[PDB]
Amino acid sequence: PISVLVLFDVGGRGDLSFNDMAALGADRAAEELGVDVVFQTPQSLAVMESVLDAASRSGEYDLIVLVGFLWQEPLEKVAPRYPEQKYALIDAATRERYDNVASYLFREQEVASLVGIIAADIANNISKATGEEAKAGAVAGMDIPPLWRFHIGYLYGVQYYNQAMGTDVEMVWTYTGRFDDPTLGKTTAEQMLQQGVRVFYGVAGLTHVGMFNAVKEAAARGVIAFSIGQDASQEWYDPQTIIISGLKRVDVAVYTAIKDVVEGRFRGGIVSLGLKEGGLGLSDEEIIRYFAEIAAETGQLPEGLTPEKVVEIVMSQREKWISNDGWRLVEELKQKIISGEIKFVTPQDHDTYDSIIEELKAGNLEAALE
Numbered sequence: 009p010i011s012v013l014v015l016f017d018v019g020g021r022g023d024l025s026f027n028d029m030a031a032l033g034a035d036r037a038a039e040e041l042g043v044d045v046v047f048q049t050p051q052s053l054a055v056m057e058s059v060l061d062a063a064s065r066s067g068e069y070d071l072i073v074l075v076g077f078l079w080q081e082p083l084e085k086v087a088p089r090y091p092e093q094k095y096a097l098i099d100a101a102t103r104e105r106y107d108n109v110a111s112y113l114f115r116e117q118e119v120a121s122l123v124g125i126i127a128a129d130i131a132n133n134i135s136k137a138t139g140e141e142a143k144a145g146a147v148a149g150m151d152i153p154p155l156w157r158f159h160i161g162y163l164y165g166v167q168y169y170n171q172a173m174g175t176d177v178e179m180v181w182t183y184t185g186r187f188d189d190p191t192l193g194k195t196t197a198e199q200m201l202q203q204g205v206r207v208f209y210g211v212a213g214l215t216h217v218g219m220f221n222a223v224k225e226a227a228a229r230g231v232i233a234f235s236i237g238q239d240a241s242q243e244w245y246d247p248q249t250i251i252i253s254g255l256k257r258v259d260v261a262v263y264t265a266i267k268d269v270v271e272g273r274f275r276g277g278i279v280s281l282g283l284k285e286g287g288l289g290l291s292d293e294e295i296i297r298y299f300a301e302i303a304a305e306t307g308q309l310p311e312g313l314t315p316e317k318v319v320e321i322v323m324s325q326r327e328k329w330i331s332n333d334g335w336r337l338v339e340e341l342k343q344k345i346i347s348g349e350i351k352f353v354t355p356q357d358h359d360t361y362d363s364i365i366e367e368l369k370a371g372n373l374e375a376a377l378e
């Protein structure tokens with residue numbers, strides 16, 4: 009039949025996040041379209057190029073699916089050596105343009121900005137109900153382009169909220185440097201708790217499962233704090249504290265790239281995905297229950313909890329801790345974005361990214377746009 013290699017960056021499955029999303033798209037293609045999928049996880053960064061070269065060399069795969077930005081460097085080198093080997097790069101796009109490479113990029117600014125508004129609002133409500141100061145936050149993985157877009161969008165969204173509302177909610181963003189270190193994710197979060205961070209956006213793959221656990225042990229100590237999921241809806245992991253999730257439809261990327269090949273309509277080039285296409289979004293009722301169903305039938309849903317009970321609890325907390333102004337502002341930005349009235353800039357260098365943040369920290373929001 010048709011044969012696909014899914015080639016992870018760092019972690020592999022068990023994410024609850026980025027890669028498990030990617031596998032889901034591949035798993036759906038195996039069953040619906042009848043293809044053979046092989047997964048594979050390099051044990052080092054050093055070896056990525058050799059491994060990518062050997063799989064192309066093998067002639068066994070109609071498509072090689074590359075899950076993560078870190079594949080961009082090795083692919084730029086390998087792709088031209090095997091021009092009849094088809095590749096899908098997920099969450100990144102190659103510097104040059106090849107016929108044998110379909111890139112799937114997301115516009116993370118779009119969804120993170122919506123999240124920024126929400127977290128600023130939840131932190132505002134925490135402060136208003138408690139009288140103690142509550143910051144927004146994020147525990148991030150590696151310092152790389154997609155996370156630049158998250159960062160920019162998240163800060164944008166917080167400042168937007170602040171300006172539209174006369175609040176001065178602060179935001180603390182920490183790169184941990186790894187996507188596969190839950191323990192480091194937890195210690196990072198525990199430090200942040202003691203610097204007043206109370207709302208925690210997870211932008212670090214597996215790493216921010218530790219973040220989730222840090223916010224649980226805080227809630228257990230009586231402290232009012234909340235987490236925000238990314239990639240999949242992760243509310244099911246602990247719904248009392250995981251109030252919402254930014255969605256990134258990596259599964260649709262992978263599934264679309266595999267379908268295209270199955271129907272001989274593959275073609276090289278960039279495919280950009282944001283709110284307009286369904287590629288990004290926020291976690292709603294059905295999406296929450298869907299992933300909860302998955303974890304239920306996976307036996308990794310926590311004790312004494314069903315998919316239906318998970319939804320009831322999240323909706324309960326969104327009634328309690330997200331004001332209507334939060335939603336009004338979400339909707340007012342979501343619509344300025346879809347309409348084209350707003351479009352973010354994709355930072356070229358690290359130096360450009362760094363100065364967009366200086367400007368957003370200064371309340372100059374227009375720096376992030378065109």
Ligand SMILES: Nc1ncnc2c1ncn2[C@@H]1O[C@H](CO)[C@@H](O)[C@H]1O
Pocket residue numbers: 017018019020025026027075076077078099149154155187210211212213214238239256
């Ligand atoms: N294994 C990984 N390799 C590269 N990037 C990742 C990985 N896991 C997560 N990410 C990035 O971090 C974000 C937050 O989990 C994801 O949307 C993705 O952009």
